[PDB]
Tab-separated table of C-alpha atoms in Angstrom:
chain	number	residue	atom	x	y	z
M	14	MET	CA	98.110	93.188	56.564
M	15	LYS	CA	95.102	93.226	54.236
M	16	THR	CA	93.647	89.912	55.426
M	17	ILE	CA	94.732	86.423	56.473
M	18	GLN	CA	93.186	83.195	57.755
M	19	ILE	CA	93.831	81.726	61.200
M	20	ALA	CA	93.402	77.956	61.446
M	21	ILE	CA	93.865	75.933	64.625
M	22	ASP	CA	94.053	72.152	65.002
M	23	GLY	CA	94.762	69.587	67.700
M	24	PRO	CA	93.545	66.365	69.380
M	25	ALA	CA	91.087	68.445	71.404
M	26	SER	CA	92.455	71.937	72.036
M	27	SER	CA	91.605	73.388	75.448
M	28	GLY	CA	91.735	76.952	74.159
M	29	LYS	CA	90.701	77.062	70.508
M	30	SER	CA	87.461	78.999	70.988
M	31	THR	CA	88.868	81.626	73.354
M	32	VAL	CA	92.121	82.020	71.420
M	33	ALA	CA	90.566	82.124	67.949
M	34	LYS	CA	87.946	84.495	69.362
M	35	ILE	CA	90.266	86.955	71.095
M	36	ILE	CA	92.471	86.982	67.996
M	37	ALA	CA	89.687	87.917	65.576
M	38	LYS	CA	88.332	90.317	68.197
M	39	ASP	CA	91.512	92.377	67.855
M	40	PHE	CA	92.538	91.829	64.230
M	41	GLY	CA	88.928	91.743	63.074
M	42	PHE	CA	88.924	88.356	61.355
M	43	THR	CA	85.734	86.378	60.703
M	44	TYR	CA	85.359	83.505	63.163
M	45	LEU	CA	84.328	80.144	61.716
M	46	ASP	CA	83.720	76.792	63.406
M	47	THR	CA	83.843	73.465	61.560
M	48	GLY	CA	80.739	72.604	63.557
M	49	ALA	CA	78.616	75.417	62.142
M	50	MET	CA	79.718	74.449	58.641
M	51	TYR	CA	78.339	70.950	59.156
M	52	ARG	CA	75.286	72.425	60.881
M	53	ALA	CA	74.235	74.394	57.803
M	54	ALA	CA	74.822	71.346	55.605
M	55	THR	CA	72.928	68.941	57.857
M	56	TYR	CA	70.231	71.565	58.393
M	57	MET	CA	69.276	71.538	54.716
M	58	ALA	CA	69.383	67.740	54.797
M	59	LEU	CA	66.555	67.490	57.326
M	60	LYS	CA	64.854	70.476	55.687
M	61	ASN	CA	64.503	68.634	52.372
M	62	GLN	CA	64.803	65.081	53.726
M	63	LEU	CA	68.118	64.714	51.901
M	64	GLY	CA	69.222	61.727	53.963
M	65	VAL	CA	72.792	60.472	53.644
M	66	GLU	CA	71.394	58.035	51.077
M	67	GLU	CA	71.263	60.992	48.671
M	68	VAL	CA	74.994	61.695	48.526
M	69	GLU	CA	74.963	62.509	44.809
M	70	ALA	CA	72.141	65.050	45.008
M	71	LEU	CA	73.066	66.425	48.434
M	72	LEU	CA	76.654	66.697	47.206
M	73	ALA	CA	76.006	68.939	44.208
M	74	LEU	CA	73.458	70.822	46.305
M	75	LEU	CA	75.713	71.338	49.321
M	76	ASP	CA	78.055	73.158	46.952
M	77	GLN	CA	75.129	75.040	45.404
M	78	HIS	CA	74.091	76.396	48.799
M	79	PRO	CA	75.687	79.873	49.187
M	80	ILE	CA	76.563	79.255	52.833
M	81	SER	CA	78.255	81.927	54.941
M	82	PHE	CA	78.531	83.284	58.486
M	83	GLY	CA	77.873	86.671	60.049
M	84	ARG	CA	78.045	88.444	63.401
M	85	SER	CA	74.575	89.243	64.738
M	86	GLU	CA	73.984	92.803	65.948
M	87	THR	CA	73.767	91.257	69.423
M	88	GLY	CA	77.203	89.677	69.110
M	89	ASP	CA	75.891	86.339	67.869
M	90	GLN	CA	77.528	84.453	65.002
M	91	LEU	CA	74.572	83.368	62.874
M	92	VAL	CA	74.727	80.666	60.219
M	93	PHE	CA	73.572	81.675	56.750
M	94	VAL	CA	72.623	78.986	54.241
M	95	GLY	CA	70.435	79.206	51.159
M	96	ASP	CA	70.092	82.958	51.690
M	97	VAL	CA	68.448	82.404	55.081
M	98	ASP	CA	70.051	83.695	58.257
M	99	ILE	CA	69.535	80.860	60.719
M	100	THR	CA	71.188	80.761	64.145
M	101	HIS	CA	68.532	79.014	66.243
M	102	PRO	CA	67.537	76.159	63.872
M	103	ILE	CA	71.225	75.226	63.862
M	104	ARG	CA	70.959	73.440	67.214
M	105	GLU	CA	73.853	71.509	68.747
M	106	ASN	CA	72.582	68.062	69.751
M	107	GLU	CA	69.875	67.588	67.122
M	108	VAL	CA	72.151	69.108	64.488
M	109	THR	CA	75.026	66.980	65.783
M	110	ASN	CA	73.079	63.738	65.395
M	111	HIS	CA	72.356	64.553	61.752
M	112	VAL	CA	75.743	66.210	61.278
M	113	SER	CA	77.514	63.042	62.383
M	114	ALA	CA	75.379	60.897	60.119
M	115	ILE	CA	75.898	63.328	57.243
M	116	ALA	CA	79.576	63.989	57.769
M	117	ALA	CA	79.989	60.212	57.596
M	118	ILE	CA	79.637	60.603	53.834
M	119	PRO	CA	82.944	61.216	51.962
M	120	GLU	CA	81.469	63.325	49.162
M	121	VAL	CA	79.823	65.542	51.781
M	122	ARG	CA	83.012	66.456	53.643
M	123	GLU	CA	84.753	67.186	50.340
M	124	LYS	CA	82.070	69.684	49.330
M	125	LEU	CA	81.688	71.153	52.816
M	126	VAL	CA	85.440	71.730	52.693
M	127	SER	CA	85.145	73.825	49.540
M	128	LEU	CA	82.760	76.056	51.482
M	129	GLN	CA	85.352	76.628	54.205
M	130	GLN	CA	87.662	78.050	51.541
M	131	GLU	CA	84.835	80.204	50.196
M	132	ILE	CA	84.529	81.845	53.608
M	133	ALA	CA	88.207	82.658	53.959
M	134	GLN	CA	88.392	83.489	50.249
M	135	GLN	CA	88.226	87.193	51.063
M	136	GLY	CA	90.815	86.588	53.762
M	137	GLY	CA	90.962	87.628	57.384
M	138	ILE	CA	89.114	84.821	59.147
M	139	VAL	CA	89.820	82.678	62.208
M	140	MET	CA	88.796	79.035	61.885
M	141	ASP	CA	89.044	76.118	64.311
M	142	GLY	CA	88.315	72.422	63.884
M	143	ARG	CA	89.528	68.833	64.107
M	144	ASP	CA	89.505	67.963	60.402
M	145	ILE	CA	91.635	70.980	59.489
M	146	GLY	CA	94.877	69.156	58.756
M	147	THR	CA	94.849	68.704	54.986
M	148	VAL	CA	92.341	71.030	53.325
M	149	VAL	CA	92.046	74.657	54.434
M	150	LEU	CA	95.356	74.654	56.320
M	151	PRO	CA	97.435	74.528	53.099
M	152	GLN	CA	95.815	77.866	52.250
M	153	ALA	CA	95.935	79.325	55.763
M	154	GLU	CA	98.509	82.020	56.530
M	155	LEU	CA	98.582	81.396	60.281
M	156	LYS	CA	98.181	77.794	61.434
M	157	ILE	CA	98.479	76.682	65.065
M	158	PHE	CA	98.299	73.210	66.610
M	159	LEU	CA	97.164	73.254	70.243
M	160	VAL	CA	97.949	69.909	71.875
M	161	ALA	CA	96.770	68.522	75.213
M	162	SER	CA	96.619	65.362	77.327
M	163	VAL	CA	93.525	63.165	77.638
M	164	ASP	CA	93.753	63.554	81.415
M	165	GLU	CA	93.753	67.356	81.287
M	166	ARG	CA	90.794	67.645	78.908
M	167	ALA	CA	88.970	64.640	80.361
M	168	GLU	CA	89.037	66.543	83.654
M	169	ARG	CA	87.743	69.844	82.284
M	170	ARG	CA	84.787	67.883	80.918
M	171	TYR	CA	84.019	66.072	84.174
M	172	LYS	CA	83.564	69.406	85.947
M	173	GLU	CA	81.512	70.984	83.157
M	174	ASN	CA	79.170	68.030	83.646
M	175	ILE	CA	79.000	68.645	87.381
M	176	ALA	CA	78.665	72.435	87.364
M	177	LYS	CA	75.876	72.026	84.797
M	178	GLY	CA	73.776	70.227	87.416
M	179	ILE	CA	74.963	66.639	87.080
M	180	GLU	CA	77.351	64.234	88.819
M	181	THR	CA	79.333	62.531	86.061
M	182	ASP	CA	82.141	60.288	87.306
M	183	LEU	CA	85.722	60.843	86.145
M	184	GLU	CA	86.386	57.151	85.518
M	185	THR	CA	83.569	57.400	82.984
M	186	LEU	CA	85.052	60.291	81.008
M	187	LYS	CA	88.550	58.812	81.220
M	188	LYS	CA	87.387	55.616	79.517
M	189	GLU	CA	84.987	57.282	77.084
M	190	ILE	CA	87.808	59.554	75.926
M	191	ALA	CA	90.120	56.551	75.630
M	192	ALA	CA	87.792	54.990	73.060
M	193	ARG	CA	87.194	58.094	70.947
M	194	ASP	CA	90.767	59.344	71.317
M	195	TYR	CA	91.972	56.016	69.923
M	196	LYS	CA	89.407	55.692	67.134
M	197	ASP	CA	90.531	59.180	66.119
M	198	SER	CA	94.236	58.437	66.551
M	199	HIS	CA	93.930	55.068	64.785
M	200	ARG	CA	92.369	56.004	61.443
M	201	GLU	CA	93.518	57.246	58.037
M	202	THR	CA	91.141	59.859	56.622
M	203	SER	CA	91.815	63.393	57.861
M	204	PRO	CA	95.155	62.389	59.454
M	205	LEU	CA	96.471	65.052	61.831
M	206	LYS	CA	100.170	64.201	62.209
M	207	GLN	CA	100.680	67.967	62.424
M	208	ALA	CA	99.810	69.927	59.281
M	209	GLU	CA	102.517	70.867	56.779
M	210	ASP	CA	103.531	73.969	58.732
M	211	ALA	CA	101.267	73.582	61.764
M	212	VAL	CA	102.840	75.450	64.680
M	213	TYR	CA	103.328	72.928	67.485
M	214	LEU	CA	102.258	74.250	70.888
M	215	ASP	CA	101.062	72.115	73.801
M	216	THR	CA	99.189	73.738	76.687
M	217	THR	CA	98.433	71.290	79.500
M	218	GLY	CA	96.455	72.812	82.359
M	219	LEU	CA	97.963	76.158	81.381
M	220	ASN	CA	96.252	79.551	81.552
M	221	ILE	CA	94.135	80.467	78.527
M	222	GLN	CA	95.620	83.947	78.149
M	223	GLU	CA	99.047	82.315	77.913
M	224	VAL	CA	97.921	80.653	74.683
M	225	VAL	CA	96.432	83.773	73.102
M	226	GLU	CA	99.766	85.542	73.565
M	227	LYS	CA	101.759	82.659	72.091
M	228	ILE	CA	99.758	82.775	68.860
M	229	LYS	CA	99.514	86.570	68.790
M	230	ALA	CA	103.303	86.809	68.993
M	231	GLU	CA	103.627	84.331	66.124
M	232	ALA	CA	101.223	86.376	64.001
M	233	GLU	CA	102.578	89.828	64.846
M	234	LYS	CA	106.140	88.655	64.211
M	235	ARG	CA	105.233	86.822	61.006
M	236	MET	CA	103.709	90.097	59.809
């Protein structure tokens, strides 16, 4: 087998983390999340006040940063950028706010993409994201496309908001998702439309284990 990448795409994917995780847990592939990639990039931005306004500089720099991931002794995927293992500084919300503002830049995404390839360069890595339709996929042995319905996902979110100690209304998520879902399904850049050879597989309100098997079978057989 040597080593091979495992990319997963979809409108939302209600089993990308678990699936991609379980897979690498058995095969031993390095797990990578498009989010962390942007986290490391945005992190440096705020670190050296490289606001989006500095696309030129931040661009050449983003590529200069020897970014990479690694599993912490305590089973914690840390983000390594600039030769500094940072897993805490790479928050979610704070990093998201800057990540969204940063990612907005075209030159940024392009460079950040090159990094994704640098990670899987050695081979044997499971990656999952939304902008993985025309970039790393083309060079990804195994590529799956988990599809779902706004209703299904929108529901899973409503609960997660409740169980967390809140009382978010469904009607709220339903609408909110309708706006984003559209804006995402009504653009041009990073057009999904199913990758070149993206394995189509929809799992609506279906068990998670059922998905892991589906992919596993596709990989084992392909091998």
